[PDB]
Amino acid sequence: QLEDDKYSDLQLVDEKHTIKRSVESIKSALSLVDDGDLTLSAYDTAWVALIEDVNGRSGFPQFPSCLQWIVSQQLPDGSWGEPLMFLAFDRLLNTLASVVALTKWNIRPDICQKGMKYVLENLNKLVDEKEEHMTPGFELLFPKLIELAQKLDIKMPMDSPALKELYARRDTKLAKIPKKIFHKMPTILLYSLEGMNDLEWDKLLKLKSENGSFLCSPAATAFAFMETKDQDCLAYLTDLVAKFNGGVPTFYPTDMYEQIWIVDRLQRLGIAHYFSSEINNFVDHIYRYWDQKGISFARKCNLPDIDDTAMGFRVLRTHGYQVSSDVFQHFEKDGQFYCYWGQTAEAVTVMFNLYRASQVLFPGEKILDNAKKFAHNFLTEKVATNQVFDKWIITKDILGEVQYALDVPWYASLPRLEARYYLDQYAGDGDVWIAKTLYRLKYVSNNEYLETAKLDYNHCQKIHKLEWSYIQKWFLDLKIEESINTRTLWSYYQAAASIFHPERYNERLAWAKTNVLVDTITTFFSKQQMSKDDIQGFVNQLTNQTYGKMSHMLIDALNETLKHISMKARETHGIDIYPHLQSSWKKWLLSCMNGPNVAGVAELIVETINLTSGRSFSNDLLSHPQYKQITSITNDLCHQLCSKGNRAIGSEIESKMQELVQLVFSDSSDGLDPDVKKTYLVVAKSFYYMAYFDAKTIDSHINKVLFEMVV
């Protein structure tokens, strides 16, 4: 029912301006991205506030602004912590630390007492909390706070069942510490250094990160300074205390983690094309500080992790930067993958992100093939066992995200399909991550991305629905013998779900009509039992014998379509493409003489897209050696796919797609233009998609992508 007021042109115009305004808003907010924008932590701020004046000014703290920040942040119930997501351990850590800091420096006894009232009242309720919910290191960090409080004469209930139980778990964890390794190399243990004893600072001080911190943790670095007076540790804290007006987060910097996840989310939400300038800058930064040993959450932290590594790897490769899969060997041992030494990569989202990285593999990258099998099995079982949850991330629909990954390989993840599902899963402001304490990444998880992405999608969807009506009319006006069948909608959807942008209507519509006519021509060849000689005559009429009234009507219908396509393409660029389209169809039609009729369809579609877009003339494809190469791989690939039948997609097809991926994303300065290259992958995926899913699933995809507005 496109007679409504919402499909009117004036309404569509206002939506575009509204979308453009939101895009400019995001763009200005993204211009402020620097070293990381994280939740500030009262726990870490309190630890920094404990530092005594370094020039001997007895009775005064070194960082008074930290104490003032703490004062300003107390919640109405007397606690400190994440205001909107309540977590008992988060509140207890942030609150007792704040009380201890303020007590040490004799500040606001009224605030201290409200704070202690909350701690003492919620201490006993730790009994009612199971083991798997206690935040990382709590059994080490909270007892340490109790120790500091007792020495300030804050009396605690040490006979409480809750604390007797807590201190028991502290004792076992401390007994499990591998002291030698912990003192020999950077480990995740340094991030919780303040909760440990049995320290040989002679060796630990060799493990400082490049910015002078211990694992980029202000609390651990403040603890280290008070134990050792290390001047590098003090410099890290001084710079940090000046950047956020006293309040500090639970780790800093976080530039790699933040900028990588920005690119990922914008890409998955389907609006990354609006931020190519900003995304190119982010990816540039990621590549500049890429390391063959892996990357951390900060370029200046000395502990790489598999999650940052797997996400930066995938983002860098799909952006065209050369990166070796050998990096993952630093996170693999005896057939198992690890976040870092001592911590298996047992988290769902980490395995989710690893599975995603493994699928961009090139031929011969066995470690990525091992990772794919490993992660796919891990995730499939957590889905079957009804366990798709991460104890250390509060998100909206982690199950849906994992389900989509297992149901839709990357080779079959059409752009609009990926976005359509993620738009219902992305949490916006609601994503709360769990480290020592709860924190939020505003540049990664916010409601403005989601709202803008939903508006853009439903807007493109309105354009698609209008184009679909136009395609139905164009086909019927070519009254030859056929009707609007299911295959006609598939032919448009295949184009619209990949090249979806409203401004790219010429490419999308030309591809859609080409699918339709390829379907019609090949069906005609079959029904009429046309020989090679018959097809030969069919070609001569197209360009300049030929018999059969229906033959002449198909040739004219083809030529009229090509004339119309090139007509509309004049608005994009000025070069007349009709001769080149005729040549491309001549080449395909002649290929139907010598072999299967799907042998060169992919080349025909790709050339049509490159011509209507104008990329065939922006770059001299001509005899660039990669042109013949990518054309042959793609034709062979889509030959294997469309003519696989009822076989399953086997190893040979997977390997050929890997060949294409390697060519497409191995950008060189003198290589074929990347945008031209990526078109071949776009079409190949659309062939893979059609061979991977059954009819009923395709239909369900079509309804959701094209006809279900995003709520």
Residue numbers in the entry: 19 to 562, 567 to 733
Give the exact sentences the study uses for this entry.
The first committed reaction in grindelic acid biosynthesis is the transformation of the core diterpenoid precursor geranylgeranyl diphosphate (GGPP) into the bicyclic intermediate 7,13-copalyl diphosphate (7,13-CPP) catalyzed by the class II diterpene synthase (diTPS) Grindelia robusta TPS2 (GrTPS2). GrTPS2 is mechanistically closely related to other class II diTPS enzymes that facilitate the protonation-dependent cyclization of GGPP to form a range of CPP intermediates via a common labda-13-en-8-yl+ diphosphate intermediate. All class II diTPS share a common three-domain (γβα) fold with the active site being formed by the N-terminal γ and β domains. A conserved catalytic DxDD motif controls the general acid-base mechanism to bring about the cyclization of GGPP with the middle Asp residue functioning as the general acid.
The GrTPS2 crystal structure adopts the conserved three-domain fold of class II diterpene synthases featuring a functional active site in the γβ-domain and a vestigial ɑ-domain. Consistent with other class II diTPSs, the C-terminal α-domain lacks helices α1 and G1 and helices D, F, H, and I are shorter as compared to class I diTPSs resulting in a non-functional class I active site. The GrTPS2 class II active site is formed by the γ- and β-domains, which adopt the typical ɑ-barrel structure and closely resemble the AtCPS active site. By contrast, a His-Asn dyad, previously shown to be important for catalytic specificity in AtCPS and other ent-CPP synthases, is replaced with Tyr (Y209) and Thr (T268) residues located at the top of the active site. The presence of a solvent channel in GrTPS2 is shown to connect the catalytic DIDD motif with bulk solvent similar to AtCPS.
